[PDB]
Amino acid sequence: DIQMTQSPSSLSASVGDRVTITCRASQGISSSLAWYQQKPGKAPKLLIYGASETESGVPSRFSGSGSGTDFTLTISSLQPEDFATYYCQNTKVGSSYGNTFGGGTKVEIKRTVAAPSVFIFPPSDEQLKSGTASVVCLLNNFYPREAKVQWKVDNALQSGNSQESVTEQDSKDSTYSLSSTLTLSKADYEKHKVYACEVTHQGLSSPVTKSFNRGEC
């Protein structure tokens, strides 16, 4: 099947900005390209068909251009309702093509750089009875989204035993929150003393480490 490459994967923009999103096909498809908008929890909506024709109902600020391999979606004056994920799709039907979607471009609200406030939570004694220990690290109200969380158990770097979860951009202050859960057995938990969450971020000149001793719980 045809490959559709979207650049960038994500962009930060403000209300009133001119936004440019590119789609690149692996082979020539003339004008057979569509653009789609998708909001979280909602079905995708057609914006542009035939590379350059805007669908009725869709505001005139959305405009498509390009022919062959390189395609461009332009939003002239960006509105609060325009913050979503955007997809390109080849519409040329044929055995050698396939109607492949591009990876997507998330349009996010730009704001000032905010450092995360870091919190570490020990596992409860209720969970230890069942035989498993979950250690949770919280990163609260940060911008931008890119943040690295490193688990340290007795000063040893952990890998493959943690799961991350990130919220959507906040409705009020446009910040992200991150929750990371380190999963260990009861027997492995009781072996070790020091449990640390190390956070690196753009709004931090030095890493923030929050830690606890097991015996001091």
Residue 169 CB, shortest distance to other proteins, in Å, is: 12
Q: What share of the chain is helix, strand, coil (3-state, %, to 5)?
A: 10, 50, 45
Rg of the chain taking only CA atoms, in angstroms? 23
170: Cβ–Cβ under 8 A, 6 or more apart, which residues?
141, 176, 177
**According to the binding rule CB under 8 A, does residue 12 interact with other proteins?**
no
**According to the binding rule CB under 8 A, does residue 204 interact with other proteins?**
no
Q: Which of 87, 142, 143, 151 binds other proteins (CB under 8 A)?
A: 87
* Contact predicate 131/185, CB 8 Å: yes
Distance (Å, rounded) from C-alpha 81 to C-alpha 203? 28
Instruction: Candidates 11-19, 45-53, 145-153, 201-209: pick the segment binding other proteins (CB under 8 A).
Output: 45-53
Distance (Å, rounded) from C-alpha 103 to C-alpha 13? 19
Distance (Å, rounded) from C-alpha 89 to C-alpha 106? 16
Distance (Å, rounded) from C-alpha 68 to C-alpha 199? 45
**According to the binding rule CB under 8 A, does residue 60 interact with other proteins?**
no
CA distances to 24, 69, 114, 128, 210 from 93, rounded to whole Å, are 18, 16, 47, 57, 55
Q: Which of 121, 158, 186, 204 binds other proteins (CB under 8 A)?
A: 121
Q: Which of 5, 10, 183, 202 binds other proteins (CB under 8 A)?
A: 183
**According to the binding rule CB under 8 A, does residue 165 interact with other proteins?**
yes
Q: Which of 16, 60, 112, 130 binds other proteins (CB under 8 A)?
A: 130
**According to the binding rule CB under 8 A, does residue 122 interact with other proteins?**
yes
**According to the binding rule CB under 8 A, does residue 134 interact with other proteins?**
yes
| Residues in touch with other proteins (CB under 8 A) | 1, 31-32, 34, 36, 38, 43-46, 49-50, 55, 85, 87, 89, 91-96, 98-104, 117, 119-124, 126-127, 130, 134, 136, 138, 140-141, 163-167, 177, 179, 181, 183, 212, 216-217
